[PDB]
Paper text:
Species D (HAdV-D) are the most diverse species and cause both gastrointestinal tract infections and epidemic keratoconjunctivitis (EKC). Each protein forms key interactions to promote cell infection, with the terminal domain of the fiber, the fiber knob protein, interacting with the viruses’ primary cell entry receptor. The adenovirus fiber knob protein is known to have a highly conserved trimeric structure. Sialic acid (SA) usage has been proposed as a major mechanism of cell infection for EKC causing HAdV-D. Here, we provide apo state crystal structures for fiber knob proteins of 7 previously undetermined HAdV-D, and provide crystal structures of HAdV-D25, HAdV-D29 and HAdV-D53 knob proteins bound to SA.
We performed X-ray crystallography to generate structures of species D human adenovirus fiber knob proteins HAdV-D15, D24, D29, D30, D32 and D53 in their apo states. These structures show the expected trimeric form, all viewed down towards the apical domain of the fiber knob proteins ([Fig fig1]). HAdV-D15, D24 and D32 were crystallised in only their apo states, whereas HAdV-D25, D29, D30 and D53 crystals were also soaked with sialic acid. The observed space groups were monoclinic (P2_1_ P2 or C2), orthorhombic (P2_1_2_1_2_1_), trigonal (H3 – R3 in hexagonal axes) or cubic (P23). However, there were varying numbers of monomers or trimers in each asymmetric unit, presenting a diverse picture of the fiber knob interactions. In this article we present seven novel structures of apo state fiber-knob proteins of species D adenoviruses ([Fig fig1]). These provide a good basis from which to conduct structural analyses.
Author numbering:
A (entry chain C): 178 to 383
B (entry chain A): 181 to 384
C (entry chain B): 183 to 385
The structure:
C-alpha cells in the first residue's frame, strides 16, 4: 500500500520467484521474466527452470514421443495489460517492481508494456493471399536458441511470439515455444537467460 | 505534441519503404530507441514483390537469388542520404505510431560511434597495441523466414561499413542462405541488436 | 548518458589479459536501462596464444578456449585479479572516462537474488531449487565477422569467488573448428542482465 521504491518502468515475476508457472502441471516451474520499459521498446530477459514433472529431467531415450520434446508457455493480457487466468504464469508475483519484490497492490494498467497492436496485429485471413498489402506472420516472432544447463551442446529452439494468442479473449500475448531434435538423456529443462526486445504499445490518449 | 526524439523509426506498420531488388518492393520495419550510450534496435524485413517475394532456389539456382543487402547511409547530421535502400518519407522521429510533421534536422545521437566503428580499418605493419577491430563493426546472427526455425538466414549487421554518397555513418543488413528454399517469401523474424552511439555535437 | 554508462571506452588501448598482460582490447559498454543493464562486448587479441589461432600447429585444448573475468567488490569496483585492467574502466565522459576512479557502481552489478553467487541444491526440495543456467547467456560470436568462424560464447553472472568478489561478469570462449591463422577478433554481442538495486540511502 504505497512505497518510494516502486518502479513502474519494470514489470516482472520477481528475480528469484517461487514456482509460478505451468509447463505440464500447476507450479511445476519457475519463469523469471523481466520487462524493462526503454520508451518505444520493451527490453526483456527470460529464463525457465522446471522443478517437477515431464520436463524436470528430460529423457527422450525412455520417453521418445514428440510431446516429450516440446512445450509452450503463454502470457495472456486483457485491454489494460492485466494477466488473464488461462496464462501459464500465475499472477500472484507478476507485478511492477519494488526492490527485489512486487508493489503492495495488484497493478491496474500495464498497456505500455504490451506488444504494439500495429507492429504485431492479431490477423484476418480471407481470399487475397497477396494483394501486396499482405501483413507479416514472422515480424510477430523472434527465433533463437536457449541452452539447457548453460551448456552450448544442449540447444533448445526458442520462438518468442507477440499477440499470436486468442485464448480467454486476450487483446495482447507473449508466447514462448520451446522444442529440440536432440535426444537428451537426463537433462533438466533449465534454460540459459535470453535477452530480447519488442516494440511497445502506447498508453491510451485520455 | 506526442513527438518522441528518443525513438527514430520506419513506423511500426510501414507502407513499402525499401529497395531490395527494385523501388518499394519491401517493408523494412526498423526501430532505433536511444538508451544513452547505446541504441536498442529491432529490425524485420518483408519483401512484397520481385526476386525475393517468393524465394525458389530450385527454379532460380545460383547465388544472386540467395543473398542481398539493405543499406542506410547517413550524413554528418544523421540525415538519411538518397543512395539508401530505405526511402526517407516515413523515416523520422516517433509521434504516436506515426512520424513527426516535418523531416528531422539532426539524429547524430542515433548514429553508430565513429571511434568504436571507424569507417576504414587497415592495420598496417602497425604495432599490435595500435590494431583496430574489423569484427567489432559487425553483428553476425540468423533471422528465420516465416518465423520458422527450419528456415534460417545468415544476417550481418555492419556499422559505418559504407562509403557510398560520401556517407559519414551507415547501418548495413546483409542477408544470405545456403538452404535451397522452395516458395518461401522473404519475411524475416524480428532481430534485437544494440550498437554504441555517437555523442551529440558541442556541449554534450 | 554519463553516470548511466560504465565502460572500457569505445576505442580502448590494450586493457585485457587473455594469456599475458595487455595482450587484448576488450570493448565492454554497460548502459543502465533501470532494472536491466544493456551490454555490448567485443574482444580483439593483439598478441600471444590467441592473436593468430592455429589449431593445426597447436592442437591442444588450452589453444581452443579461454576465459575473461571481471571481479567486483561490494561497491562494484573492479578487483585486481580481473582480466580487465581498471585504468580505463570507469563512467563515461564523451568517448573517454571521468577524471577520477568511481567509488560505487553497485547499480551496474548483476542482481544477487537473480544470480546468486553460490547456489547448489544438495538436500533442496524442488520449490527451493536454484538455477545454474539462469546466471548464463549462451550464444556464438564470429571471428572477423565471418559467419563460417563461430565461437561458442557464454556470459556468466556472479559465477566467480576469486579475490573474495561479491559480483562477477565472465566471458568464456571456446571452438571445435580447427582454425588455421585466424586472429581472435569477435563480432559484437548484445546482451542484458537484471541489475542489483542501489542500497537504501537515508533508511
Ligand atoms: N549534455 C546536455 C544534457 C542536457 C540535459 O541533461 O538536460 C547539456 O547539458 O547541454
Amino acid at each position: 500500500v504505497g512505497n518510494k521504491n516502486n518502479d513502474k518502468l519494470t514489470l516482472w515475476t520477481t528475480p528469484d520467484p517461487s514456482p509460478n508457472c505451468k509447463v505440464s502441471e500447476e507450479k511445476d516451474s519457475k519463469l523469471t521474466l523481466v520487462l524493462t520499459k526503454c520508451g518505444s521498446q520493451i527490453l526483456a530477459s527470460v529464463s525457465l527452470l522446471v522443478v517437477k514433472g515431464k520436463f524436470a529431467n528430460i529423457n527422450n531415450e525412455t520417453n521418445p514421443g514428440e510431446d516429450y520434446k516440446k512445450f509452450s508457455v503463454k502470457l495472456l493480457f486483457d485491454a489494460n495489460g492485466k494477466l488473464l487466468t488461462g496464462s501459464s504464469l500465475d499472477g500472484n508475483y507478476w507485478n511492477y517492481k519494488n526492490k527485489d519484490s512486487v508493489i503492495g497492490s495488484p497493478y491496474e494498467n500495464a498497456v505500455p508494456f504490451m506488444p504494439n497492436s500495429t507492429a504485431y496485429p492479431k490477423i484476418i485471413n480471407n481470399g487475397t493471399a497477396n494483394p501486396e498489402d499482405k501483413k507479416s506472420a514472422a515480424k510477430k516472432t523472434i527465433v533463437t536458441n536457449v541452452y539447457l544447463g548453460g551448456d552450448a551442446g544442449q540447444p533448445v529452439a526458442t520462438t518468442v511470439s507477440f499477440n499470436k494468442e486468442t485464448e480467454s479473449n486476450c487483446v495482447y500475448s507473449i508466447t514462448f515455444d520451446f522444442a529440440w531434435n536432440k535426444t537428451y538423456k537426463n537433462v533438466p529443462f533449465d534454460s540459459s537467460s535470453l535477452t530480447f526486445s519488442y516494440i511497445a504499445q502506447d498508453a491510451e490518449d485520455k
